[PDB]
Design an enzyme around this catalytic site. Structure first.
Site, PDB file in Angstrom:
ATOM      1  N   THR A 134       9.707   5.032 -24.037  1.00 36.08           N
ATOM      2  CA  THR A 134      10.963   5.279 -23.342  1.00 36.08           C
ATOM      3  C   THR A 134      10.717   5.553 -21.862  1.00 36.08           C
ATOM      4  OG1 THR A 134      11.283   7.680 -23.354  1.00 36.08           O
ATOM      5  CG2 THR A 134      11.442   6.528 -25.463  1.00 36.08           C
ATOM      6  N   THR A 135      11.757   5.355 -21.060  1.00 29.91           N
ATOM      7  CA  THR A 135      11.608   5.386 -19.613  1.00 29.91           C
ATOM      8  C   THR A 135      11.607   6.818 -19.092  1.00 29.91           C
ATOM      9  OG1 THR A 135      12.690   3.237 -19.432  1.00 29.91           O
ATOM     10  CG2 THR A 135      12.540   4.575 -17.438  1.00 29.91           C
TER      11      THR A 135
END
Lengths: 227, 242, 211, 221, 229, 183, 220, 207, 230
Positions: free
Chosen positions: B29-30
């Site tokens: 995930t970012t």
């Protein structure tokens, strides 16, 4: 090659499954637990007539009220039994009381997965039979996978597939100890390749009054006549 | 056949296991980091895998000592392992000396630890890229550490699945604000960048987590952005989408 | 010890605890150091008063800061119902002291942990280099246990006297005991620190109080 | 330390290294042991005969050990057995029983089949003797897997199947060989399907038969 | 088949993993050159910072090992930092054990021996870096010692490392205060690489009698301006 | 010995005597007691520990940049705890004095005195020390204090060695008995 | 010196269906009073009361480790109640774990045996233990036990008129009479021992559970 | 403390006192000084009671392990050897008493310095001289079981009377081939008067 | 080529041994966890090897305030529960502090992660649902071999756990507000686990229920104790 502690894509350890298939080749052992005791019987399977069958110890004493049968690579069974006996004696030393049968089975099964780079899991299956005030007469099936179940009646070894079905058919909660002896002998006679007698089969039982005992060839012969 | 062991050079001189760890990082995930004029802002996209997740309780950003914040993408347990090592390292520095560990020193310690995991085939490379930083006696520092052990200082950093769009937005931020961003507007812009980068992962809902360490706003200590400021940043990000 | 801190005196009143210690580090009969803060606030509900070896006291101070930092890790409620309690801090310190004594490397100190628990109970417990721990309505170390304890026990003789004791009475007794200790203790100082932990008003730390 | 798991289960449940150690045993020379009422007779079928060791080795005054397979591994096993017998004498005040010594040797062999970095002994041993202050003969066998069992008559090495068939047809567990002459003659007949003979008797009376006696036995047969 | 995966001999007597570490030394595509003056040693290293999000002051392949020794590394920065930390520890330990600063050549031999160990033991891979040590030795004067992944090291009159190390090397061969030496090195790197440098494209380290130091972007711009005049 | 460090308006000055004795025997009367552990961090005892501290501070300088006098005192404590006067100058701290008495505790003081001769000058230094002294005033104060300490202490004597730590650099001053004894 | 004396006397009396463990609540150092209420008799669960008398730090450590062992026993035996004799063996092993650096404490545990009768065990600091009907520990043990022997076991008492030939027969003492005797003996000890006073805490173990009673002693 | 054990045709008689003293203070009059190691083995404590208790219980555990392995009970010689090796490796007086089929009735004396002696009679403790003399004057191999029990009682009584640190009561044990038998606790106070009345001894004591 | 060791990344960045350890859980019997603000409930479907055999214990009790249920390799669950008990014991001994559920979950996280990065070991083949009550209230944690530990309102692990998890998602707003009525929360857990059955029904021997709460110590219901909830 592959690591000993590897998982298969189905979530199963390779060496454990191979050890179970090693167990499948062992001599048959049958245990029946009743309200008056637990009866353990093993198939001797002497490899030669010169082999002294009275030296085959496939039923051993762990504690005064705990005994077990073994099936498979019985050389690993001796190490397992030495650990079990040490556990029972250490329990009596540390707590001034006899170990519980389920606790003894847990102590034994704690060794099951303690292998990797122990080189391999044990290649033997145990039928642990015992009595205590907490749970009465109990019968456990210890596996090298680390799992064990309490069994009313259990058969392990080469002939376990049909023996377990026969135990399913025959076992009920109202069996008496002598009925348990007759049932164990009947199942052994059914599954043993040899003709059953007092020299190629062994019987043992655990009772509260007399503890763990192994039936002599004479008494086993008298019980065999009753069939 | 040179990609089956960690410490093997390919005939071109590459370590393929480190590249595979980088692939694992890119799957994550970012998470972003913005270095403001007096502090650092960390923001991370937390995917809501199920409605049964307790909101605001599966915290991703971790504090090291009291002045260092760490956020990472990829294999979260690897990031937790790295953060545990970093906490041990900060404690050892604060025992041998007395000052809290400087951010460049902490970055070097983490880099040495991660690089040591590429030296042997008995160990696996870290499957995380860590954005970390904080405020020390020399100001604010922001670092991104890769699975190879490589790390650099950054004005703005991004990793994860939506790392490309987040990097574009951080580049726009650096271009538009040479004067140096303010901590509160940095928090708002971190919310905006995370929301923008989530468009590459729109198939699922996400929860925004922000933390900051500012000399003025948080007194040089790492604190999570919660309450009124968090909701304000969320509204700013939601408005900035339209 | 070689550089030494003198008595720490403490008592609990109806709404909290008061702890006091002077700001002097003696070097034998030489009054060498006069800026030694021996009351250590831990959080907002605990004050640790240390006597004896000053270097060991600084070690304990570092340990307390490390404990706070470690508790803050991965704990979103560290400033909340998951904060360090006076009982937790005392248990940690007593474990450290007992383990040091068992290794024949004792931290040559006497520690009083003063604070209020989350439920509001007053916490006032003592531990020394031997690991000996006890609690009392009034506690004192060294010269305090001989001279200030009689004066404080005149105010709070038993547990039932605690609710009848106001903060003003307790602080007046503590200041009188500090004055008496200055008069009759050669290794004491005019300047002392006083901390009040109240279940309602919180931690009040007073510095540079003078006999 | 080297701890690679060399003895592991095959998919069919077999430990291949133990099977191959058993093959190494089956390529050993011979160890025929015939137990009687009072006798345990052990036998085997430019070399310097004076200094070439006899296969039967005294573990203690009352217990002897013959073997089959790798001689070098057997030396290590025999050394461990002798040290264990001496330690048992030292600490438990008593000489070892034949079963206790057999159990210890089989335990070492079993330990070598599930320890990392080691291979199993390619040795099977015939352990014979008498328990202290006792008179009933004992004849045990150990194998590389660690399995130990008691036998009235047993053979290990090359031609073990043929000699075991000969024993099974000539030895009768109903009436064991009555005399030492019967024990020795049965052993020599089994070995005739060069002969060395050792007779183990109670009270540590262990003697190797001379070549003249063995020649008389052979000529009688 | 596994002779290419661990540092054992091939049938031709070669260590393929060492050669692949040599290949890895050029991953960063950075060229560096070291020149000795009569009083000072100067290292010029290319500084390529393509990402605009990077803080350029952190991108650096020149390390200050001790007061007098500097090191410029050609290769990945994690292995470069590993070698830098090891060299700093070695320098401090030498100072502690023997009462004086470690000479540049002794440290180069120190690190080459470590590389040899990595070359001979199977569980250690080689570091894919080339280490150039520079100092002004109190006995030998200005010094350049370069170590490679094979454990091989030697002193140099001048040296260049990188993908275009050959061009710079032949240029220096053709040619064959510290500000003039820096200007010479920058001009010669410009000529060899055929590329004008801005103040942000270069890293400069200067080893003098009393200390090794690195020039800042302002100092590098000053030297570039001096070259322009 | 008589060692004393004083912070002043431009930095810190470390002063010491030069006499080492084995009982009544003066074994060395030109001893240099002011020891450099880092560039502008100096220490004095009232020798192996100094070497280990210098080792650790060199490592710290290589890895984390220039250490402060507080860092040097921290290393000194972590080695001793598991009498030292540590004086040093840094741009932000503008000169610091740390005393580490025999117990292993660390104290930051405007000035420190240590050794067998400091006892005779405790009162004099208390009466005469002033904050923000000039460099010449500080040198005079140290000269008078160490002269009294040498006069009254049998283990103190020889020349008065001074190290001035300021932003300008390190200055070494020597004062012979013919000069300070007549003060 | 890693050891010390904090005073304190404890008394464990095993009845026919009860066990009492009583101790004074005064904590002292030398001639000072540290606390007037510092209990040293602790209910440890499973109707077992323990008191480790002697060095206060070692007593705290031993009580803590025994409570830990009881918790581990419950973890391992599915919350099974620990018997008093099993607890005694466990305490023996805990004490012998430090054979050469012993807990400088004499510990007494009280409770009901598996038959329901009161049980009292006393332990040597090194690990020896013995089941007793009564045992006193601490400094004032010699000022308490003779009186109880006279009054509980009727030692040196004979039936009047029998010319000392018929001993006074033993009798069932109720827990209330035993409490009265404990109170009187502790008041006498407080009178004649400077380390005894400030309060008497008595823990009564019956089949119902553990009951705590506190009585005030003289504070001088 | 006075412990005695002697060998006779009926087995082994083990007699002990029960007094434990902390200096001049008699802490207990009911201390068990005989260890029931197992139904066939007895140990006695005389000094170092805690080491004796722990290590003889551990000796019982080792005997049980030997029972399980060899299908045979450990011998008195083996148990005494184990205890003596344990004592020596940590370098009290203890008697190991047992009756096995092979050895018969066997007593081994093990003390703190590591000595290990087999014998027919042993006495340890502060009162060992008086009891030892009573035994030497009255001991016989052909002694009956009742007479041997009385002899043990009488020796302990003499020791308790003359030695200040011996007394309380006599605990009698009788080791037979079927295992030891406890013959009860006998208060020294009552026993002295009974023996004075029936035997005519202790004429210097007014009764 | 990449599944033989936990120390190897796949070309796509995957760890195949960890995924196989997860598949080990997916072969296990379903156990359901859910909680309200005051109570946390474990519902487990015990599995028996044979109808002559007993049912394997699925729920383990740590202490009065915490307990867990397992899916997958039982010995791995025992090892992890022993480590968890050791951690809680250390907390109680050194700080007189009840270990928080989240901190215990993170300790399990670290212990599980250590086996996924170093050669020689294997990932634990068990998943755990840890329920506990502390000063912050009721807590339910899901532990995975990969090291991932998650705090949830409700969850299900094991074979066919998707039906139970979907039902919990549908019922979420109802059961999180049950609050101080533990029997209703246990009922909701029983319906959730019944949503995951295929052929066998919930029986007296099959069902095992645990609960912990504000004034509720960790108690396990087995046998006839669950007949009121079936």
């Amino acid at each position: 090659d592959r690591g000993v502690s590897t998982f298969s894509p189905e979530g199963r350890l390779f060496q454990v499954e191979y050890s179970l298939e090693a167990i499948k080749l062992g001599s048959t052992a049958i245990g029946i637990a009743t309200k008056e005791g637990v009866v353990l019987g093993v198939e001797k399977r002497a490899t030669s007539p010169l082999l002294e069958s009275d030296s085959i110890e496939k039923i051993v004493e762990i504690d005064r009220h705990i005994g077990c049968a073994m099936s498979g690579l019985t050389a690993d069974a001796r190490s397992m039994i030495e650990h079990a006996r040490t556990a029972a004696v250490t329990h009596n030393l540390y707590y001034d009381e006899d170990i519980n049968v389920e606790s003894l089975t847990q102590s034994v099964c704690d060794l099951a997965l303690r292998f990797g780079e122990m080189s391999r899991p044990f290649g033997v299956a145990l039928l642990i039979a015992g009595h205590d005030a907490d749970d009465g007469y109990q019968l456990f099936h210890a596996e090298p996978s680390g799992t064990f179940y309490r069994y009313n009646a259990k058969a392990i070894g080469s002939g376990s597939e049909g023996a377990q079905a026969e135990l399913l058919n025959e076992w009920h909660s109202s069996l008496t100890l002598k009925e348990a002896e007759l049932l164990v002998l009947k199942i052994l006679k059914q599954v043993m390749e040899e003709k059953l007698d007092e020299n190629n089969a062994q019987l043992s039982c655990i009772t509260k009054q007399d503890g763990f005992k192994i039936y002599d060839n004479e008494k086993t012969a008298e019980l065999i006549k009753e069939l | 056949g040179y990609d089956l062991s960690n410490s093997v050079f390919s005939p071109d001189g590459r370590n393929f296991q480190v590249e595979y760890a980088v692939k694992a990082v890119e799957n994550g995930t970012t998470s972003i980091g913005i270095k403001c004029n007096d502090g650092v802002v960390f923001a991370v996209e937390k995917l809501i895998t199920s409605k049964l997740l307790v909101p605001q309780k599966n915290v991703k950003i971790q504090v090291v000592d009291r002045h260092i914040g760490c956020v990472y993408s990829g294999l979260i347990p690897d990031g937790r392992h790295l953060v545990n090592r970093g906490r041990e390292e900060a404690a050892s520095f604060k025992k041998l000396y007395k000052t809290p560990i400087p951010i460049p020193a902490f970055a070097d310690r983490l880099g040495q630890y991660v690089q040591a995991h590429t030296l042997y085939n008995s160990v696996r490379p870290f499957g995380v890229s860590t954005i970390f930083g904080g405020v020390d006696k020399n100001g604010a520092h922001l670092y991104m550490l890769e699975p190879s052990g490589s790390y650099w200082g950054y004005k703005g950093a991004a990793t994860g699945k939506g790392r490309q769009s987040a990097k574009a937005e951080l580049e726009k931020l650096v271009d538009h604000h040479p004067e140096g961003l303010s901590a509160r507007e940095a928090v708002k812009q971190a919310a905006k960048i995370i929301y923008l980068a989530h468009e590459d992962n729109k198939e699922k809902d996400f929860e925004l987590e922000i933390s900051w360490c500012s000399l003025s706003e948080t007194n040089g200590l790492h604190k999570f952005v919660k309450g009124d400021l968090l909701q304000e940043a969320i509204d700013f990000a939601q408005k900035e989408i339209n | 010890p070689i550089v030494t801190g003198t008595s720490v005196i403490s008592m609990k009143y109806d709404n909290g605890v008061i702890i006091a210690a002077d700001n002097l580090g003696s070097y034998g009969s030489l009054l060498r150091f006069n800026g030694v803060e021996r009351l250590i606030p831990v959080g907002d509900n605990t004050v640790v008063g240390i006597s004896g070896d000053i270097s060991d006291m600084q070690h304990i101070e570092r340990l307390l800061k490390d404990l706070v930092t470690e508790n803050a890790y991965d704990n979103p409620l560290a400033d909340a119902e998951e904060a360090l309690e006076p009982s937790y801090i005392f248990e940690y310190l007593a474990t450290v002291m007992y383990q040091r004594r068992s290794k024949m490397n004792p931290l040559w100190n006497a520690i009083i942990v003063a604070g209020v628990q989350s439920n509001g109970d007053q916490f006032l417990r003592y531990v020394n280099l031997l690991g000996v721990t006890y609690s009392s309505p009034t506690l004192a170390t060294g010269f305090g246990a001989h001279m200030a304890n009689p004066l404080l026990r005149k105010v709070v003789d038993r547990e039932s006297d605690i609710p009848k004791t106001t903060v003003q009475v307790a602080e007046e007794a503590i200041v009188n005991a500090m004055r008496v200790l200055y008069y009759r203790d050669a290794r004491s100082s005019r300047n002392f620190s006083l901390a009040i932990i109240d279940k309602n008003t919180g931690l009040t730390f007073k510095k540079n109080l003078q006999v | 330390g080297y701890d690679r798991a060399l003895s592991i289960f095959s998919p069919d449940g077999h430990i291949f290294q133990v099977e191959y150690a058993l093959e190494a045993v089956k390529r050993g020379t011979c160890a025929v042991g015939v137990k009687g009422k009072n006798c345990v007779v052990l036998g085997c079928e430019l070399q310097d005969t004076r200094i070439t060791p006899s296969k039967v080795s005294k573990i203690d005054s009352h217990v002897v050990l013959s073997f089959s397979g790798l001689n070098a591994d057997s030396r290590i096993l025999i050394e461990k057995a002798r040290v264990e017998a001496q330690s048992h004498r030292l600490t438990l005040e008593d000489p070892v029983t034949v079963e206790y010594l057999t159990r210890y040797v089989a335990g070492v062999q079993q330990r070598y089949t599930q320890s990392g970095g080691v291979r199993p002994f390619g040795v099977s041993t015939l352990i014979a003797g008498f328990d202290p202050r006792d008179d009933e003969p004992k004849l045990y066998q150990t194998e590389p897997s660690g399995i130990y069992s008691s036998w009235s008559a047993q053979t290990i090495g090359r031609n073990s199947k043929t000699v075991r068939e000969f024993l099974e047809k000539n030895y009768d567990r109903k009436e064991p060989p009555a005399t030492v002459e019967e024990c020795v003659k049965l052993t020599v007949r089994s070995l005739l399907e060069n002969i060395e003979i050792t007779v183990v008797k109670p009270d540590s009376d262990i003697v190797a038969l001379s070549s003249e006696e063995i020649n008389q036995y052979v000529t009688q047969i | 088949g596994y002779d290419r995966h661990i540092t054992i001999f091939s049938p031709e007597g070669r260590l393929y993993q060492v050669e692949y570490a040599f290949k890895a030394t050029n991953q960063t595509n950075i060229n560096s050159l070291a020149v000795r003056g009569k009083d000072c040693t100067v290292v010029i290293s290319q500084k390529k910072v393509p990402d605009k999000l990077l803080d350029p002051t952190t991108v650096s392949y020149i390390f200050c090992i001790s007061r007098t020794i500097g090191m410029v590394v050609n290769g990945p920065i994690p292995d470069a930092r590993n070698a830098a930390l090891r060299a700093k520890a070695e320098a401090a330990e030498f100072r502690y054990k023997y009462g004086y600063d470690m000479p540049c050549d002794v440290l180069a031999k120190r690190m080459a021996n470590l590389s040899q160990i990595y070359t001979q033991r199977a569980y250690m891979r080689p570091l894919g870096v080339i280490l150039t040590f520079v100092s002004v030795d109190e006995e030998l004067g200005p010094s350049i010692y370069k170590t490679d992944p094979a454990g091989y090291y030697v002193g140099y009159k001048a040296t260049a490392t990188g993908p275009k190390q050959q061009e710079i090397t032949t240029n220096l061969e053709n040619h064959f205060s510290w500000e003039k030496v820096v200007e010479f090195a920058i001009t010669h790197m410009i000529d060899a690489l055929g590329t004008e440098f801005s103040k942000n494209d270069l890293e400069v380290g200067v080893a003098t009698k009393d200390k090794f130091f690195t020039l800042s972007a302002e100092n590098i711009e000053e030297r570039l301006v001096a070259i322009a005049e | 010995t008589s060692i004393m460090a004083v912070t002043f308006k431009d930095g810190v000055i470390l002063g010491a005597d030069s006499r080492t004795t084995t009982g009544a025997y003066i074994a060395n009367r030109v001893t240099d007691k002011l020891t450099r552990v880092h560039d502008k961090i100096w220490c004095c005892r009232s020798q192996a520990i100094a070497d280990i501290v210098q080792y650790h501070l060199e490592l710290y300088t290589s890895q984390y940049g220039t250490p402060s006098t507080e860092t040097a005192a921290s290393v000194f404590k972590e080695l001793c705890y598991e009498g030292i006067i540590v004086a040093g100058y840094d741009d932000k701290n503008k000169g610091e004095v740390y005393t580490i008495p025999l117990g292993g505790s660390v104290h930051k003081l405007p000035y420190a005195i240590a050794g067998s001769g400091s006892t005779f000058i405790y009162g004099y230094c208390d009466k005469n020390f002033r904050e923000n002294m000039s460099k010449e005033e500080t040198v005079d104060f140290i000269k008078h204090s160490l002269s009294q300490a040498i006069k009254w202490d049998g283990s103190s004597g020889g020349v008065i060695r001074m190290v001035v730590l300021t932003a300008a650099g390190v200055e070494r001053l020597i004062f012979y008995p013919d000069e300070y004894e007549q003060l | 010196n890693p050891y010390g004396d904090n005073g304190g006397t404890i008394l464990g009396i095993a009845g026919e269906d009860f066990a009492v463990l009583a101790g004074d609540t005064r904590n002292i150092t030398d001639y000072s009073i540290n606390s007037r209420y510092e209990p040293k008799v602790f209910d440890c669960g499973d109707n077992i009361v323990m008191s480790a008398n002697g060095f206060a730090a070692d007593g705290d450590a031993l009580v803590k480790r025994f409570k830990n062992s009881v918790k581990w026993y419950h973890f391992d035996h599915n919350d099974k109640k620990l018997s008093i004799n099993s607890a005694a063996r466990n305490i023996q092993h805990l004490l012998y774990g430090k054979r050469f650096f012993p807990y400088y404490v004499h510990t007494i545990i009280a409770g009901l045996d598996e038959d329901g009768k009161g049980a009292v065990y006393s332990f040597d600091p090194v690990g020896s233990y013995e089941r007793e009907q009564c045992r006193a520990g601490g400094a004032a043990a010699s000022l308490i036990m003779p009186f109880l022997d006279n009054q509980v076991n009727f030692k040196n008492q004979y039936e009047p008129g029998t010319n000392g030939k018929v001993k006074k027969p033993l009798k069932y003492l109720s827990v209330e009479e035993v409490i009265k005797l404990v109170r009187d003996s502790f008041t006498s000890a407080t009178e004649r021992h400077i380390q005894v006073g400030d309060g008497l805490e008595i823990l009564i173990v019956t089949k119902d559970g553990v009951r705590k009673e506190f009585y005030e002693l003289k504070r001088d | 403390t006075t412990t005695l054990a002697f060998r006779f045709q009926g087995g082994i008689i083990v007699a002990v006192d029960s007094r434990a003293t902390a200096g001049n203070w008699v802490a207990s009059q009911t201390v068990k000084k005989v260890i029931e190691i197992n139904p066939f083995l007895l140990g006695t404590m005389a000094g170092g009671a805690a080491d004796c208790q722990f290590w003889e219980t551990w000796l019982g555990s080792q005997c049980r392990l030997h029972e399980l392995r060899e299908k045979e009970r450990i011998s008195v010689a083996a148990a005494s050897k184990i205890l003596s090796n344990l004592v020596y490796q940590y370098k009290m007086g203890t008697m190991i008493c047992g009756y096995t089929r092979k050895e018969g009735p066997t007593i081994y004396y093990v003390d703190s310095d590591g000595t290990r002696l087999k014998g027919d009679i042993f006495c340890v403790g502060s009162g060992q001289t008086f009891a030892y003399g009573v035994l030497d004057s009255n001991y016989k191999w052909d002694l009956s079981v009742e007479d041997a029990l009385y002899l043990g009682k009488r020796s302990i009584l003499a020791a308790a009377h003359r030695d200040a640190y011996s007394g309380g009561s006599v605990n009698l044990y009788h080791v037979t081939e079927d295992g030891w038998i406890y013959h009860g606790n006998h208060d020294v106070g009552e026993l002295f008067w009974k023996v004075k009345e029936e035997e005519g001894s202790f004429n210097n004591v007014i009764g | 080529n990449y599944d033989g060791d936990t120390v190897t990344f796949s070309p796509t960045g995957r760890l195949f041994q960890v995924e196989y350890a997860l598949e080990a859980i997916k072969q296990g019997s379903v156990t359901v966890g859910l909680r309200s603000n005051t109570h946390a409930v474990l519902v487990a479907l015990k599995r028996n090897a044979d109808e002559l055999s007993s049912y394997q214990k699925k729920i383990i009790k740590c202490d009065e305030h915490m307990g867990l249920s397992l899916a997958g390799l039982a010995p791995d669950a025992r090892v992890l529960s022993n480590y968890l008990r050791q951690q809680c014991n250390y907390s109680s001994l050194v700080f007189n502090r009840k270990l928080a559920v989240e901190r215990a979950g993170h300790l399990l996280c670290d212990k599980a992660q250590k086996n996924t990065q170093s050669y020689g070991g294997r990932p634990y083949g068990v998943g755990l649902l840890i329920i506990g009550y502390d000063k912050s209230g009721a807590h339910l944690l899901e532990f995975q071999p990969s090291g991932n530990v998650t705090e949830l309102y409700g969850t299900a692990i094991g074979a066919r756990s998707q039906g139970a998890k979907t039902y919990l998602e549908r019922t979420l707003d109802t059961f999180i507000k049950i609050d101080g009525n533990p029997d209703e929360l246990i009922k909701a857990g029983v319906e959730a686990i019944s949503q995951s059955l295929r052929d066998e029904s919930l029986t007296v021997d099959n069902l095992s229920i645990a609960i912990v709460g504000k004034d509720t110590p960790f108690t396990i219901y087995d046998g006839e104790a669950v007949a009121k909830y079936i």
